[PDB]
Design a protein around this ligand. Sequence first.
Ligand SMILES: O=c1[nH]c(-c2ccc(Cl)c(S(=O)(=O)NC3CCCC3)c2)cs1
Length: 125
Amino acid sequence: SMNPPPPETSNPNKPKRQTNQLQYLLRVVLKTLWKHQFAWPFQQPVDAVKLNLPDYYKIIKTPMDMGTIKKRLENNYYWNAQECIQDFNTMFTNCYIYNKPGDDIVLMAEALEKLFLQKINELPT
Ligand SMILES: O=c1[nH]c(-c2ccc(Cl)c(S(=O)(=O)NC3CCCC3)c2)cs1
């Protein structure tokens, strides 16, 4: 298929964890970003069949999206906040890689990244 399987949202041989920071990343960071007017392209894995982008997964080898991140947080999939933050950063970076400076989609990612950084600047202790 043109679409690989989406990233795992559970893994039984990976240990789980819950922390105040991870709770915050779900309740505040993810759930607030989700509502932004520019969040929609990032709420699910890129569907190359739907969007007609047979090139997407030829270019992006570590795909990530907020739908996956949300499910991971709900699963307690992550060990710590930094691991989750890395997924957000991978999502943003993928967008910059797959596209071009100034593209509408890149403008969207740039705005979301700024808001994301604002919110993770300070996490609970
Ligand atoms: O690098 C990424 N692009 C996208 C994405 C998702 C949906 C849509 Cl419509 C778009 S887009 O920038 O408006 N390009 C559309 C024009 C043809 C394919 C989709 C990008 C999510 S991550």
